[model samples]
Target: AFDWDAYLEETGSEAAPAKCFKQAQNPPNNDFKIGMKLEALDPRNVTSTCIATVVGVLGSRLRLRLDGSDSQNDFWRLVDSTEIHAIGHCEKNGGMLQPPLGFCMNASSWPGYLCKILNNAMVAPEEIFQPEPPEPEENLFKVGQKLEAVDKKNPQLICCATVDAIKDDQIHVTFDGWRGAFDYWCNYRSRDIFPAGWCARSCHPMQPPG
Candidate 1:
């Protein structure tokens, strides 16, 4: 009845060792709320910061939507992740916040945009978001084993996947139903990839293969 584990064994593949994962640091309780505006590292432009709003919360992580972007690209980060910061921390630390690539709205409504979001009393405090998750220690994945991973193009979608190849330190994720078109390489420890049953704990529906 379970196709995932059967698919793994029938194909002669093994699962990665379930070790203490990167963000496994006694996950902090997510105390943030929906609509809480904060500054966050734009995942697509890892080096840039953007104004973000908390759109959803799952367990110890917060789903964030960029202020200037559409909801189609929302991403998740641990509540304690250093990638997120209290509002105003970017400029205070010598960094400039950038609008999301698609942001052409009321263009430059900067002062008002900043003022409007800042006036919110539910801002996240500095300390709760200070601890960053440590990096993955090693690439322990092998080919053929399946895991759950975020579909980058449709990040809000977590699909059933298999480790089709191991290149360097990153693992290639191939979505089960979409053939190779959805296959992409991230990392063994990317928060996007997870062991089976991860969604059950996260209370998310794990998409099944075709």
Candidate 2:
């Protein structure tokens, strides 16, 4: 098992204070099923919502594959993520679900495909979606406070990270042992960043410093 205290001591880094993170101490309920359908904002194109299926479910996260997209484009979202909603959520808000970016077929076939998928689909229940977490009133992270953060360039990896810098509402996350190759800035309240020990508690494999 990974030991945070031992690792921190070995690396000479201090844990990021709990107040610096936006994640709740306990994860939200994961009531979604593998075959359920819903709508999600395209990670590559956030302005549009697309039909998605829950391809995999684990812990409090869902592995979503867009209805008309390729397998390689599947993404994950926490149960309480604001970026996803019930299947009818888009239309109820005066919007139509769009084909995912890089849809697998001709553009003209989207409507027919959409109609077929929505027919008798097991839509994720409204009760299963949790409300998004509230943002903290201020950025509490400090330089060199160690945490865990997603590697944006490779979304699948959650690795050890440190607060490299902070400006206004943004915090620069630098991967612990990657030198200058895998660092980026994100909002203090960004869902991709989590407190130390988050990966372990969530059952997500954490990439050791590299």
Candidate 3:
């Protein structure tokens, strides 16, 4: 029951410009399947390469739950982001898979975790992994366009949103529901925002704002 139109006027604020942020030239492709394991940098640790499972895929990003890490800390990364790679990437480059931070679980759990992930029926094809996408495009959004996007505060939930302001390259994304507390500025092509209904053909359901 909040009025977004009135609030934008009241604040006298504008969306971030399109050029102020960075984004990929084109959308990455995600063929990841749930249960496929890959190597990913621990977002919290940033320095560790731990086993990860593809828990969800919405559009071009994968919901990666780090191995030895709890579901509460799951993260989303684009299929082409450097943060993730094919299961054996680290080892092929003369590195070892590191356990998550503070993961002092019984050492016996390590082999099993690694083996179980590889044996899963949904393991992603080894060739599916790639480095970051191209880095030359600025956001191309305009004001008033609609899209499906995730709430940054709650990445697990995707909602319908509008491009409220456009300047150069930074874009202001505001939810049609709720107050401006949830509005944010991001790259015009940020993976968090998708073409309206872009995920429906693949079975992703967009949650309407509360």
Instruction: Please list the C-alpha lDDT of all candidates, in the order they appear.
Output: 0.72, 0.86, 0.69
lDDT of 2 by residue, 81-140 (tens): 899999889999999989998798999998999999899999998999988877789998
Per-candidate TM-scores read: 0.78, 0.92, 0.66
Q: Write the per-residue lDDT of candidate 3 for residues 111-153, one digit (tens) a residue.
A: 7666665674455776777455444365556687666678888
lDDT over C-alpha atoms for residue 92 of model 2:
95
Candidate with the greatest lDDT versus the true structure: 2
Alpha carbon lDDT at 22, candidate 1: 52
Poorest 10 consecutive residues by lDDT, candidate 3: 15-24
Error of 2 at 25 (Å): 2.1
Q: How much is 24 displaced in model 1, in angstroms?
A: 1.6
- Pairs that collide, model 1: none
Please report, as a residue range, the 10-residue window in candidate 2 with the lowest summed lDDT: 18-27
